[PDB]
Amino acid sequence: QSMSVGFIGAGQLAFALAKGFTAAGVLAAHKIMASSPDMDLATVSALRKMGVKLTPHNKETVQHSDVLFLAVKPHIIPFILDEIGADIEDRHIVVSCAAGVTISSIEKKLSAFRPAPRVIRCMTNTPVVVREGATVYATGTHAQVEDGRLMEQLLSSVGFCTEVEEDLIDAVTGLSGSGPAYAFTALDALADGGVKMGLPRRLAVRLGAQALLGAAKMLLHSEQHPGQLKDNVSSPGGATIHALHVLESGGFRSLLINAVEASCIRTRELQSMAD
Amino acid sequence: NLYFQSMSVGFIGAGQLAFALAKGFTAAGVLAAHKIMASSPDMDLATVSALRKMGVKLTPHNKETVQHSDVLFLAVKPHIIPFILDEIGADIEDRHIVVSCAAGVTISSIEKKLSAFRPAPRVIRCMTNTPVVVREGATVYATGTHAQVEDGRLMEQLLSSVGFCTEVEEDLIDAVTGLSGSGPAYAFTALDALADGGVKMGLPRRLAVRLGAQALLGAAKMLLHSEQHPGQLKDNVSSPGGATIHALHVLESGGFRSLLINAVEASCIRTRELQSMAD
Amino acid sequence: SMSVGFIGAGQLAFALAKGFTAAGVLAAHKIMASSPDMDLATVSALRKMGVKLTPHNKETVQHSDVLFLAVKPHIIPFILDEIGADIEDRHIVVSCAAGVTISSIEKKLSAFRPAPRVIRCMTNTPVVVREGATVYATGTHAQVEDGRLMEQLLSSVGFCTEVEEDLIDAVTGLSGSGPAYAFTALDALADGGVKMGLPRRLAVRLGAQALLGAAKMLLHSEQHPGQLKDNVSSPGGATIHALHVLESGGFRSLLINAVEASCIRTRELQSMADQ
Amino acid sequence: NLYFQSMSVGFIGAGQLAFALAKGFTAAGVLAAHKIMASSPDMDLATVSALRKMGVKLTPHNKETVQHSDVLFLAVKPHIIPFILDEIGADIEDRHIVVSCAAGVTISSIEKKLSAFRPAPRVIRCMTNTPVVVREGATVYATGTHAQVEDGRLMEQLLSSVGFCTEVEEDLIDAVTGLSGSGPAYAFTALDALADGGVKMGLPRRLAVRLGAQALLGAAKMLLHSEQHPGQLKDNVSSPGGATIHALHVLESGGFRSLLINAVEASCIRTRELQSM
């Protein structure tokens, strides 16, 4: 491959993807360049230790890169496209990770400079850092068929990856983009429950995380409905069905629906705030 | 490169957990399916039909499992254990290691029943869970009065082939039941609901299930591979004013954390009840 | 060396003057404060302190180099109209009013004389015990030394850091209103101590000491607040039982609600002032 | 300071509280780290590693801590205390002051166990909290039957070096546990949540944590230095129609005050249950 990768933005997601790509062996750390207006972030220091090249100049990242990731906050994307739009070349694939930012808005900015910018919109999540990410992407107007395939090969090296229509990406954000945070909240609470019932905290954290990992893997490897797996686990009169009742009495299911909806709706607002 | 060439495993009970451990052990390559035997009173079970395809030896007679086996897993409902122990108690020999997976059933109660037939039965109490079927179980065990040090080491070696395994004091097992024993059910409920949320916002059901499960798997792996607090990892997900912190607020407003604490507590308390009603 | 003035002589002017002089960075006799209602108890305490007082806002301006506007937000435009013609090149105008934008201040003052030097700050009442929380944003024409001087002055009475102005309304919801959340919490904790048999005086002292020590622990630790929570809760113990009942009431969400409500009200008030 | 001239201190237990006290005692300068000895069944704990760095002498044998100590802190979970008092009870001498930090454990229960060995054991019961590590603890103590007058004074001076300290009647200690014993955890929970609120409204997490902690620290110091009621200080903060009074309304609508009362009560009641074990 010998592909050169750039990140405009050096935050948590740029660090997670760089760490994933290098652990996967797809990219040498020193073939990645990242830029940031704030060179004093801790994520910048971890990238530096990894061997990723760092610069304060977004133009240098663009000129270095073959595949260019836009890993900045959604409201910063239009100022970035103005700043380095003249430096995007025909050889570039521009991959936007910003939540809610549409392919159309990016192409409208970039097309004022060169006529056929190759744009891909991505929604991924922090577990790419352990090569278990969940990624979807949509291809832009001028993205070649080989561009989508390259993107899927690259993002599949750090987790699940699949092409979607762009109009699903805001909902994906609410589910798997924000999802790891729902899981971290759940794991902290489950550990608190283990401690309340007499477990040492260290063991309770380990057991809860292992339970959630195992259950998620069971579901991915099963063709059965999660309600069926739940039924298979709950013996009559037993401990599990008693616990499931108290979850139901609190509306546990509805809270998770509320969360996916709230994150999706906010993502749609971030873009309406832009346009 | 682990393999127990001199170990014959038996399962009394052939339900979900017996199938899960047998499938995990065989997938791990540490046991050949033909060196495993399972017994059940209901030989028309879907799990019995599956064990047969793996190559596991099947019999309706619990005494046959006992005579075939060195390591004997009791994988039956907790109220069935006293009748099982009466049935096969006279068939327990010096070579047997009895491993009870029955929730709540104490080492003391098993040893009392078996000791009426022959002194010094070797007993280990286990709490495991169904993801051993994909070799990602969470298992704890406690050793009985007459279990040798080598017995716990062997059982940890075997149960570590299908997931996490550690020794604990017996008085922690009811709490473990509430956390990692019942935990997969909490996760299945959460994943159904997360998929409903994805569908509400316009995703196809199949994709919503896949993405939700991948999100949960990835987050759990992140935490297991990190020394950071789960609150610090959560903080790293949520950018200021963004989508995730908005969703976290609505979880908090419904007392999401407290529901999970309530669940661990309720499963643990019910486990203590089942045992106390046993005695 | 420096001459500080206060337009307004209420709770905030007293807290800042008490803090500054307790810190030894200003002499009380080098400070002037003005007030329309010279009968306020805060005006009497400033006089007992040694601060020079006056009812004429214009006298404060002529005396001062650094000029704090410590009036209510709705009074700021009237102040700027009354003294705008007296602002000289030497003045640094520091607005402490919630919500009021640098833009709106510069617009009024610029009609009189170009390049007014303006700082916007958000502080809180614990500056009176030199443990305030202060952020500030520099205006269009504030020199670099203006911000450094302001941070040096306000660091003597607590934490102080520069921020972009668009964060200040959120800071108001967190540390501006935060003391009030803590006073409410301390009253309730004391009620709980009293319910369980403690004398009120002891319950107030113990609750306040607990909150002070925990806050200092967090400020002195590199660890996440959830980690310190974990370190404190022994398995099956009293603390994890109490944390469960907080969680069951949605304790965390109420504090999120509060920060949000204060921030939103601050934005609301400014939107009424601009229109 | 002649109390601490030649004083040796021992910890039976090396968890979070033993480290916090040893760190606070040494930071205050009241005792040299080498004059402190700790014992733990598991040298694999994280706090046992930190105590070793400080220069605190370690050992696995509680008998070694007893022989070394003049003042002996019992910093173990409440259900292990009877096994500890059986183990080293024969080694408690008239020279020892035994200070129990285990929650709910009554002076009577300790004196009953130790009086079977020698007749006049000097026992003090203590409820302190983890901020002694930054010398801002909240400590109460009650003196036992045979504690001399100088024992209480010695206790007050030692624990005053790491924060607030006062003597109480023992029947108040369960309630103190619910308030200042568990209180730091309530504050850590509140600070996490306040920071989430800051983040929701656009602040970087690092800044939101710093501002929220500073607000809490400053408000607590204000109240400690004021003669005014917390409600009057609250009233001073809230301008008419303003941001703060709007936020206070949403706290009230969720019963914020009742949750903190519920917490103090739940921790106190659990402590009473443990005391019945």
From Swiss-Prot, chain B:
One of the record's GO molecular function terms: pyrroline-5-carboxylate reductase activity
EC number of this enzyme: 1.5.1.2
Modified residues (N-acetylserine): 8
GO cellular component, one term: mitochondrion
Recorded metabolic or biological pathway in which this protein acts: Amino-acid biosynthesis; L-proline biosynthesis; L-proline from L-glutamate 5-semialdehyde: step 1/1
Region forming the signal peptide: none
Compartment(s): Mitochondrion
Reaction(s) the record says it catalyses: L-proline + NADP(+) = (S)-1-pyrroline-5-carboxylate + NADPH + 2 H(+); L-proline + NAD(+) = (S)-1-pyrroline-5-carboxylate + NADH + 2 H(+)
Entry binding sites for NADPH: 14, 16-17, 40, 42, 62, 76-77, 103, 236
InterPro entries referenced in this protein's UniProt entry, alphabetically: 6-PGluconate_DH-like_C_sf, NAD(P)-bd_dom_sf, P5C_Rdtase_cat_N, P5CR-like_CS, P5CR_dimer, Pyrroline-COOH_reductase
Keywords: Acetylation, Amino-acid biosynthesis, Disease variant, Mitochondrion, NADP, Oxidoreductase, Phosphoprotein, Proline biosynthesis, Stress response
Enzyme class name: oxidoreductase
Keyword Phosphoprotein among record annotations: yes
Record GO biological process: cellular response to oxidative stress; L-proline biosynthetic process; negative regulation of oxidative stress-induced neuron intrinsic apoptotic signaling pathway; proline biosynthetic process; regulation of mitochondrial membrane potential
Subunit structure: Homodecamer; composed of 5 homodimers. Interacts with LTO1.
NCBIfam families according to UniProt: proC (TIGR00112)
Function (record text): Oxidoreductase that catalyzes the last step in proline biosynthesis, which corresponds to the reduction of pyrroline-5-carboxylate to L-proline using NAD(P)H. At physiologic concentrations, has higher specific activity in the presence of NADH. Involved in the cellular response to oxidative stress.
PANTHER family: PYRROLINE-5-CARBOXYLATE REDUCTASE, PYRROLINE-5-CARBOXYLATE REDUCTASE 1, MITOCHONDRIAL
Disease: Cutis laxa, autosomal recessive, 2B: A disorder characterized by an excessive congenital skin wrinkling, a large fontanelle with delayed closure, a typical facial appearance with downslanting palpebral fissures, a general connective tissue weakness, and varying degrees of growth and developmental delay and neurological abnormalities. Patients do not manifest metabolic abnormalities.
Protein name: Pyrroline-5-carboxylate reductase 1, mitochondrial
Species of provenance: Homo sapiens
Lineage summary: Eukaryota, Metazoa, Chordata, Craniata, Vertebrata
